[PDB]
Amino acid sequence: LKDYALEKEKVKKFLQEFYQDDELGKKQFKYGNQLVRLAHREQVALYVDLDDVAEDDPELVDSICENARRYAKLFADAVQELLPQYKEREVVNKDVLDVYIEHRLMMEQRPAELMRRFELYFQGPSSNKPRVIREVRADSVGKLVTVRGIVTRVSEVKPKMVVATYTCDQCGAETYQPIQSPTFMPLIMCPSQECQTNRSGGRLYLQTRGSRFIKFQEMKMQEH
Amino acid sequence: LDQEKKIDDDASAHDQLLWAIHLSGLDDLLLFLASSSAEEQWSLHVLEIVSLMFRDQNPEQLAGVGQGRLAQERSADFAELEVLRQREMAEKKTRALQRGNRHSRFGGSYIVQGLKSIGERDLIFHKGLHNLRNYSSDLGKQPKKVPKRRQAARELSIQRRSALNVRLFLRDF
Ligand SMILES: [Zn+2]
């Protein structure tokens, strides 16, 4: 419908230029100040508020609410493209995946979703009144909805694979597999050109150390 | 092929047949036919009989047969059993050292910095630290099918020590 290339630049303009006053009328860029923390790995979750987006583009709010998942991906891409602009410090590596990414970067100097350690969420606009579970009908499929309910069952936090990282035994190269679906096919044989042209028969070993996991939790909500 | 799996010091069908010849005394008739000047016409026949009789035997091994062989062969069998067992135990210990004392799904990966891979990147090793003492690149490779033309020739039969009675009879013959 819309040109997502132009929409990404609109999202960049919002994230760069929006400002709000918090204290004594002083002006702060609430999303630039958080992009700085995201770049420094001080903050991981960025809750972007569509009430803030409504202050300069209600049409963008309508587009986000009506096609939310697409715009969630667009906002994530825009934030990742923006963080190098806000880099001003070196990260203290504390995750083993930070250490692996550090050595990956050094070896590349000598996977965007893999380099992406942040997560972006839409905080819903107040114009969207909260529904009950029974009112979340098929017309709202693929759309941003607010739902009230009783939590009645919550699973343990489980590791959900996001980017599976493999290593080849023959050629010593890393292979990456982004995972969108709830299921995926593991990679067996190395697809690298060095193995393929030589018919080397080198296979792939998953490296959980190098792969990206995310906390995952299922729950059940119930009507009041 | 089914019943050639007889173990040594046992009476095969050929051994029983030779014993039948011995007890019937046709062996002495074959000696007569071989020594006779008048019946020289059957020399090729008698030669073929003797050849097929001594088909399985070895001359020095047969010539070594005698009265005191049972104790010798019994002790030799026990000693050879122990030698085989010790060899198998040694090989088992070497394999147990070559693999680690952790189960195979115990993970861990290493970069061998000096070794270039088939590409320019350093070798990533996955088969456990224990294997890097005697590392070789052919640890996980399947050997090759020798094509039919290049398949080496194999010896047509195993040697088995025939029955002692038949061996004594063949020595005397
Ligand atoms: Zn490879």
- Give the distance from residue B120's alpha carbon to the nearest chain A alpha carbon, in angstroms: 8
Q: Using CB atoms within 10 A of its CB, is residue A218 exposed (0-12), middle (13-18) or buried (19+)?
A: exposed
- Which tokens in the block code for residue A175? 């292979």
Upper half-sphere CA count for residue B160 (Cβ side, 13 Å)? 16
The reply to whether A191 touches chain B by the CB within 8 Å rule is no
Radius of gyration of chain B (CA): 28
- How far apart, in whole angstroms, are the C-alpha atoms of residue A61 and residue A39? 26
Whether A172 sits inside 8 A of B109 (CB atoms) is no
Residue of B111, B126, B135, B137 to mutate for A, most A C-beta atoms under 10 A: B126
Interface test with A, best of B104, B113, B122, B124 (most A CBs within 10 A): B124
Stated in angstroms to one decimal place, the resolution of this structure is: 2.8
- DSSP lists the bridge partners of residue B112 as B123
Place of tokens 């419908």: A1
Q: Are the beta carbons of B117 and A173 separated by less than 8 Å?
A: yes
Angle between helices A32-39 and A4-17 (to 10 degrees): 100
User: Are B117 and A205 in contact (CB < 8 Å)?
Assistant: no
Contacts of B142 in chain A (CB under 8 A): 201
- The one-character DSSP state at A204 is E
Let me know how many helices (H) and strands (E) chain A has, helices first: 8, 10
Round to whole Å and give the CA distance between A53 and B91: 74
Task: Say which of B119, B140, B141 has its CB closest to residue A171.
Answer: B119
Point out which residues pair with A158 in neighbouring strands. A216
Q: What is the DSSP string of chain B?
A: --STTPPTTS--HHHHHHHHHHHHTHHHHHHHHHH-STTGGGHHHHHHHHHHHTSS--HHHHHT--TTHHHHHHHHHHHHHHHHHHHHHHHHHHHHHHS-SS-TT----EEEEEEE-SSSSEEEE-S-GGGGGG--TTSSPPPP---GGGPPP--S-------HHHHHHHHH-
AA identity, residue B129 = L
Q: Which two tokens stand for residue B77?
A: 């069998």
CA angle centred on A101, ends A100 and A103, rounded to 5°: 65
